[PDB]
Amino acid sequence: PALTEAKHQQQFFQFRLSGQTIEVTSEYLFRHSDNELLHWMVALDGKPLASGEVPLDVAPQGKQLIELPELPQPESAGQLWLTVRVVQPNATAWSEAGHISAWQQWRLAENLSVTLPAASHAIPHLTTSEMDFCIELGNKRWQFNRQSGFLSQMWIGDKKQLLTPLRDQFTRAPLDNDIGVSEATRIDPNAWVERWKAAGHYQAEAALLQCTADTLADAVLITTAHAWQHQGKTLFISRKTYRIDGSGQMAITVDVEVASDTPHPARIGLNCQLAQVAERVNWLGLGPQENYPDRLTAACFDRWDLPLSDMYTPYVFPSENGLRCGTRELNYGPHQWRGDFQFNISRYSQQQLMETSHRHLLHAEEGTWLNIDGFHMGIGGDDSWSPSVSAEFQLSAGRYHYQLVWCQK
Amino acid sequence: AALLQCTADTLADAVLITTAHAWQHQGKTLFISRKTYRIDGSGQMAITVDVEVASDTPHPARIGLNCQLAQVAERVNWLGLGPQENYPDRLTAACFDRWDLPLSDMYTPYVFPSENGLRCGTRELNYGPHQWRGDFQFNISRYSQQQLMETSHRHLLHAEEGTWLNIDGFHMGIGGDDSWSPSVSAEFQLSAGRYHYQLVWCQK
């Protein structure tokens, strides 16, 4: 995946957008751009609105100003994106015809959705036992395991949707940059993974603090709080609310407090194991390939669609992989998640990835593992023997908050 | 502010008010603000605010609330970065502690009236018989932002009835590399699009 980041950063055309004008700067020293054209597209949340194609004629180290046609007016709510690509019409000694050599994307106009959600003539019915909160709307059921505080099961019709309950996730299946040169028989305290292990990030347990279920005028509101503790110390506090509305959508709100004296958590998100295994993963966000908070710039915002296999990046040494950032919508099987998040969908649990030493020893688990991160620490990479995650990619803000809408589809 | 959503629900031990507003200008939505108020049985009001900023719109100067309190009190007591005026990109001198200043000293008499007196990193604010808790920046004064904006000289300001209180979840840096070309560094610009903050307002 990372190779595409290199390709992007090292491209020979720089682009600067000002209004309707794209300034293209050549970084060629000797050759004039005599086999290139600029293809451009405007899209509204993944929908193509306009496009064009301009012969790109730039002298070595020179500039060309390309003014775009009056760009479409954002029909409805959403964000317009402008994408440009320098394509090489003719094949060369080292490239196929149609080779894309450079690209860049920008945000244009954005319309905020002031549209009110449609009213529904139905209010999820809340049944309360001592074991659970059982919410029923139409053919959908949600079961919150009242002893744990987590959404334990969901039914569609009669099919159980979860294998593992929806829980908070703070750890990462250590990357090579997290491990560095620390070893079982020779520990390097500074390595992130050592700090996390020492802090008990991989051992912290969720103590259910708060647990309530309330009926709203048109919804059910579940509120919980957990203390993630280790050796008597609270590491994380997580307060979550679930709002089941009459359209069958579950709005999840998560607030996290991180103990300031505790090594910054690897991630802040949720995860569960879906019973459903589906073929394709369809999503709106930065892609198509794996991209991380500090390795985003090559990724393009669009509607992507990949067979599930391609969500997993077969690194020889199993570790956390496949994160996709800036996702506004995720479609999988009969589930849709909306909001603004990073996600990682796979057949291996973080635990399995952490334990396994070689790629070929991994075993696809039953169902599908899905991680949805509100926040995620950068991966670093200045060197793999001394913590190289820049401060602005460390989850150091103390208080975190994110929202997620989980509906069928 | 166009009122979009407006509901009031009774919880098992609280009242939950939920509203949404669209801040619009010439047909364009600039901000969407969704707020919830939870009045609990101890008399504390938990306020949650979610803001969406149109990405194509110059980054808002601040993101907060304000009101005008009827009460004028003598001292302002608070837990946060102080004691003197400090801003997102001018914090490092300020010390975190329990501070206490006569209200007059919250106002910084700049000869050319402008926004002044912000205190950042505040976890608790006590004024009169009101207590705000959370994590915010605040600006308490006798002049409205409007009056400050309009007035050309310090000596022309008129202390207004009551007390103006601004509570910011977020606030743009003040800059200062030069005063003739926008010098606010990117990381101090409110450019994240989605914002969220919480505030507890109880008596005391």
Swiss-Prot record, chain B:
It comes from Escherichia coli (strain K12). Induction: By allolactose. Substrate binds at residue 180. The chain holds residues 821 to 1024 of 1024 of the full protein. The record marks 180 as: Important for ensuring that an appropriate proportion of lactose is converted to allolactose. Belongs to the glycosyl hydrolase 2 family. This is Beta-galactosidase. Homotetramer.
